[PDB]
Amino acid sequence: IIVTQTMKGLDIQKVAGTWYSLAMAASDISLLDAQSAPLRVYVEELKPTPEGNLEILLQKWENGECAQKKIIAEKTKIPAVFKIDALNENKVLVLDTDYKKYLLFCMENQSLACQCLVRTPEVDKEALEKFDKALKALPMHIRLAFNPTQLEGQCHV
Amino acid sequence: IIVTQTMKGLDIQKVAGTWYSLAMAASDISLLDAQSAPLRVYVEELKPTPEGNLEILLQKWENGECAQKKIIAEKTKIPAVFKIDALNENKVLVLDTDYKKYLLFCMENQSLACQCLVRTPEVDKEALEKFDKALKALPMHIRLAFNPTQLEGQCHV
Ligand SMILES: CCCCOc1ccc(OCCCN2CCOCC2)cc1
Ligand SMILES: CCCCOc1ccc(OCCCN2CCOCC2)cc1
């Protein structure tokens, strides 16, 4: 465990819909540095399922182009923690959300990336303040923030 | 002007000697993102001159290799502000330093990069706290921090 902060009383159905990745931070620079870095992922829409699993729609820069991706995160016994299947066991945690404006999450596993999601392409200084407070507890070495023009573009260009 | 914060009473001869670039931040992601990004520069030594100009020794990743660079920053009427000659007029400002441990500086010109320099390859949390306070005033969108192993390597690898 590195991330311990979780949303109390999370109702996953209420995170459905569109989101923007306003800012991102990660434990290691290589996770976010280039446009093609592995965790440089731009979240577009969250689609929880009736059983309370979570489909995640996002964009990622791969092979010189902006690709659409669709991921499923399986629920656990903890409502704020989900699991993605891979060669390694990857954990997704919801740290905090008010449903209507911002959502903070982290993905982990020793290594870690977190984002501040917002509902609209605006610089929400209070959401970023809450993101930065949550990151105080974590060993981050790279932090990115994006402007409204980028959020409204493709793969944040 | 963007950066307004300057070291009161700066004695430039006292910044001489070795330094490490513990952390960096910039106004635009492309200034720092890849290892070959333009402002990804790792400061190794400062050499003020008898007339109070400033030679700067650093490393930069260029063309797949770590190159040694030597730059001169010319003094101005303001002791904390220096100027580098280029196709554009580039301004270097000393924001704060205690000479013995940390030094904060920014280079500017609309666009901007700042670093936290430290004397030894240790994570100085107080120096980073002071860096982050100074950056609160500035429109940064990328921030990097480096670990002791990287500081002791070549071009921070
Ligand atoms: C409540 C917020 C849930 C969103 O969490 C995630 C967002 C993006 C993720 O993407 C991880 C990287 C996706 N890979 C990119 C490269 O291709 C394979 C998928 C994972 C979880
Ligand atoms: C008091 C601290 C002074 C140090 O300030 C600077 C540090 C690094 C700098 O480097 C700027 C980029 C150098 N270029 C890299 C690419 O080749 C040409 C030089 C400039 C000022």
Q: How many domains does chain A have?
A: 1
Structural resolution in Å? 1.9
Specify whether the CB–CB gap between B94 and B71 falls below 8 A: no
Experimental method of this PDB entry = X-ray
Domain of B77, CATH number, reads 2.40.128.20
Specify whether the CB–CB gap between B27 and B111 falls below 8 A: yes
CA torsion sign, B140 to B35 to B149 to A134? positive
Of the partner residues B35, B143, B147, the one whose CB lies closest to the CB of residue A143: B143
**Owning domain of residue A82:** 1-157
Quick check: B144 and A142 CB within 8 A?
A: yes
In degrees and rounded to multiples of 5, residue A152 shows phi and psi of -85, 0
Of residues A33, A146, A10, A89, the one with CA closest to residue B156: A33
* CA B138 vs CA A24, A116, B153: distances in Å: 18, 20, 30
Over B110-136, what HEC string results?
A: CCEEEEEEECCCCCCHHHHHHHHHHHH
Chain A residues within 8 angstroms (CB to CB) of chain B: 29, 33-35, 140-147
Residues with a CB atom less than 6 Å from ligand 1 = A 15, 41, 43, 46, 56, 58, 60, 69, 71, 84, 92, 94, 103, 105, 107
Polymer length in residues for chain B = 157
- HSE-CB of A21 using CA atoms within 13 angstroms: 28
What atom in ligand 2 is closest to the CA of residue B97? 1
Query: Which residue among A53, A92, A95, A111 has the greatest number of ligand 1 atoms within 8 angstroms of its CB, and so is best to mutate?
Result: A92
Q: Which residue of B has its CA nearest to A23?
A: B141
Any residues with CB less than 8 A from the CB of B22 and at least 6 apart, and which? B115, B116, B117, B118, B123, B124, B127, B128, B145, B146, B151
CA angle B45, A144, B56 (to 5 degrees): 15
Quick check: A144 and B147 CB within 8 A?
A: no
Any residues with CB less than 8 A from the CB of A142 and at least 6 apart, and which? A25, A26, A28, A29, A31, A32, A33, B142, B143, B144, B145
For ligand 1, atom 5, the nearest C-alpha belongs to: A92
Look up residue A88 and give its amino acid: N
